[PDB]
Design a protein around this ligand. Structure first.
Ligand SMILES: Nc1ncnc2c1ncn2[C@@H]1O[C@H](COP(=O)(O)OP(=O)(O)NP(=O)(O)O)[C@@H](O)[C@H]1O
Ligand SMILES: Nc1ncnc2c1ncn2[C@@H]1O[C@H](COP(=O)(O)OP(=O)(O)NP(=O)(O)O)[C@@H](O)[C@H]1O
Ligand SMILES: Nc1ncnc2c1ncn2[C@@H]1O[C@H](COP(=O)(O)OP(=O)(O)NP(=O)(O)O)[C@@H](O)[C@H]1O
Ligand SMILES: [Ca+2]
Ligand SMILES: [Ca+2]
Ligand SMILES: [Ca+2]
Lengths: 309, 309, 309
DNA sequence: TTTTTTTTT
DNA sequence: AAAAAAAAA
């Protein structure tokens, strides 16, 4: 896995620590790079890069796996329960582990409350043999009240301070700061294989819609967004972790609500979960663009303690 | 067909295995090569290449076929049904076997669901004397959930594990990795003549729009795309197989949706099928740029089980 | 016409069959050759070529024709109707017979549909005393569906299989293969004087833009293109036939669409017909660079059956 | 000579 | 109802 399996094939140790200084730490890191990105770095020439690709095919052989084998290959994925019964009946165990999940609501619909439950149910050994592990929370608005975890820890009957250390927290302040903070995620995931389970970005579009103006800087903004979602897709295959992202909404005076992000965000997301209000403490949850489950509905209950029934 | 029919015309066996190491395996492989591409390879001189072209015209004679003969020549093409009745009424048997078909939707419109049905209906002996065979699936986003094949296998009344081996799967990770993986397709098609029927690339533009930036690397990206579509056109004549490609969409603040790819992709595609949403589980399918069928519409139904009515 | 009229002027028969092996078949073939091209061939010396030019001026005398005589000299040209009324009102009988015509569209604009009608209307005895004859179709993309001729044969009330033999078909696979296939056209035209009327290349730039890269091989590509267009100009005077060529288009992020080919193709073409989309099954056709008709517009209708009104 | 990208309220 | 930008071989 770690990139020391190449030095027995002609690679000298003088520059294999150099690609570590960019951030590459795994044998799939050279599988997930363009050949011109290794033209940009200080001190690697255009005519020596082929010897790293010499040890790429003879260590990770890109033949043609049959889908029968790929059926047993995909058994390593896991599922995170949401807290309810009909909500992960709507998903099939909840959140997939090799895909990007989206959830958008009006304003009060309980997006971060769904996230705050997921910092608690994901460290408990549950269904599917899922053993539970550590969480990274990348907040961007302000909403990481930690004492809200302590109420949900009671209704699952867990100790308080045993769970307040297994979540990692950092707030981005700028849309470029949100991008560079993904490099710390790659360093944090690699040195402990298997102790982390999922990652939460609070709202990817909470800073992109502010730092960029309207029709002038629109293509500048949508191009920088595509680099972020592609990097998150690479991490979810590199370490087999889940990602959960939310975003805001906007109106439509041309007609009546659409989630912001445009076509770039709608294509790159694997499952989108629409959330609308019902009656009192009840919320309705539809499902948009899923590779499994058709458009059916469920019913939450945001409680004292997150998602219930 | 195989390139051993040339050695009886003066070609020595010392370098006919050399052009095999590039990838050339058929008597049309020398028909589909520039004369300067055989100047680039290690150990073949500029003044000996004519003896391969000596056995080219006396084995494949490029005279002038009349179109009456070409009418009976084109009877070897086949047609893949999609799953509906009005949808291949809109196409005339469905997918052609010597052409490139395109299909683009908004985001939830069911592009990969149309692909997932085509991995099932193409191995069943159907209309036009089409006997069915094996499929190659080149995925690029992430969407190859194999258990979705098992639902569609029921509504055609086929065994489960008899069809999960006749599809081959590989995921490209990089836009250059997608190009070199076509060379494995040529090796896989050649050694078994007639057991493969079609090929699916998931989304050719899913990695080209990410790995390349805006107006700086635009001409660099569009030139590398033209090498890919021309290689796919050569394979579809070399082995008589069908190809099915999808792509994303983009907006237009100059006006209102256009499929990405530019003029290069729009010219090289033979039929393009627009897909838009109707009501509930119904989708509308128009047709763009076809050499037969004029602009008429139909109506899907994505079901439990892919395309219905 | 045939080169046996020279042997009565001192030319021995030992080498007049030699210039036949290059491809020269007519008395204008020595009028259309450089004197250094007859230095390159195996077995003809630099000091004997003048005796062929001895019988050149005393058989084709290059004096000074007056334009009054040239007015009656040019009566042998003919005109091919396209299928509409305002479209050849825009051209003046349609396609000239001693010139190169060009037509370029966006992607769906009906370029090959205009070609498919021209394989049918050119074998019918129509206006101007044009008697009709045989057609050569040099396809290069893939688009020669022959059953599309059978629909247009009905709306002109012609037999089906009487017209499916008078069109000759060949597909080029490589940009050098497209060049050498013009030598078969010269052999096919010469032995039957007057039974052929026109020639269609599908898209000259469909293979030149693929087989050659960007700014490296640009001058290499544009030099090889100029040899092709000059050879086509020589054939259209050697046998008095029409030629119809199409090409793709490209964008312009420096500004917004331009036809590809550069200045070489724009100069060597005699008439260029721009094609853009109107409403539904209607197309608008402007005219670029014509030696007659000024910039006026018309309106097609691609039908069941090609071009209508 | 060559090559199009990008929704917001 | 109504808004604009961005370059490399
Ligand atoms: N302990 C609690 N008991 C009952 N309701 C609660 C409790 N805590 C929070 N809520 C409610 O849960 C909702 C919070 O949803 P929330 O996810 O915070 O919205 P949001 O995602 O933050 N949208 P926005 O605040 O505009 O960014 C509100 O209706 C709160 O009143
Ligand atoms: N098991 C199933 N049975 C029937 N229909 C299903 C099934 N699972 C998914 N679908 C349908 O598939 C639709 C989404 O189709 P999909 O092919 O994912 O479009 P898509 O454009 O490829 N999504 P994306 O990859 O983000 O662009 C859903 O809206 C469902 O209607
Ligand atoms: N026989 C026919 N009957 C009905 N409609 C037709 C017929 N032939 C063509 N069309 C319509 O005309 C369009 C095809 O135009 P076409 O002449 O193929 O453009 P093109 O520029 O040759 N395509 P491309 O090679 O991709 O650039 C399609 O959108 C069809 O709907
Ligand atoms: Ca919030
Ligand atoms: Ca998809
Ligand atoms: Ca065409």
């Amino acid at each position: 896995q770690d990139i020391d399996l190449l030095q027995k094939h002609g690679i000298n140790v003088a520059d294999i620590k150099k690609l570590k200084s960019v951030g590459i730490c795994t044998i799939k890191g050279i599988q997930m790079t363009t050949r011109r990105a290794l033209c940009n770095v200080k001190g690697l020439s255009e005519a020596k890069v082929d010897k790293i690709k010499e040890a790429a095919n003879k260590l990770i052989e890109p033949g043609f796996l049959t889908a029968f084998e790929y059926s047993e290959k995909r058994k390593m994925v896991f599922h995170i329960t949401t807290g309810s019964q009909e909500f992960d009946k709507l998903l099939g165990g909840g959140i997939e582990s090799m895909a990007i999940t989206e959830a958008f609501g009006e304003f009060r619909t309980g997006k971060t409350q769904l996230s705050h439950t997921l910092c608690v149910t994901a460290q408990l050994p549950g269904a599917g043999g899922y053993p539970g592990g550590k969480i990274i929370f990348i907040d961007t608005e302000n909403t990481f009240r930690p004492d809200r975890l302590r109420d949900i820890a009671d209704r699952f009957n867990v100790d308080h301070d045993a769970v307040l250390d297994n979540v990692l927290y950092a707030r981005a302040y700028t849309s470029e700061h949100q991008m560079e903070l993904l490099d710390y995620v790659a360093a944090k995931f690699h040195e402990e294989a298997g102790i982390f389970k999922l990652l939460i970005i609070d709202s990817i579009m909470a800073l992109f819609r502010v730092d960029f103006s309207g029709r002038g800087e629109l293509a500048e903004r949508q191009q920088k967004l595509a680099q972020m979602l592609s990097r998150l897709q690479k991490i979810s295959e590199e370490y087999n972790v889940a990602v959960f992202v939310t975003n805001q909404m906007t109106a439509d005076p041309g007609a009546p609500k659409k989630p912001i992000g445009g076509h770039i965000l709608a294509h790159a997301s694997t499952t989108r979960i629409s959330l609308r209000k019902g009656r009192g403490e009840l919320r309705i949850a539809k499902i948009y663009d899923s590779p499994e489950m058709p458009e059916n509905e469920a019913t939450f209950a945001i409680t004292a303690g997150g998602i219930g029934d």
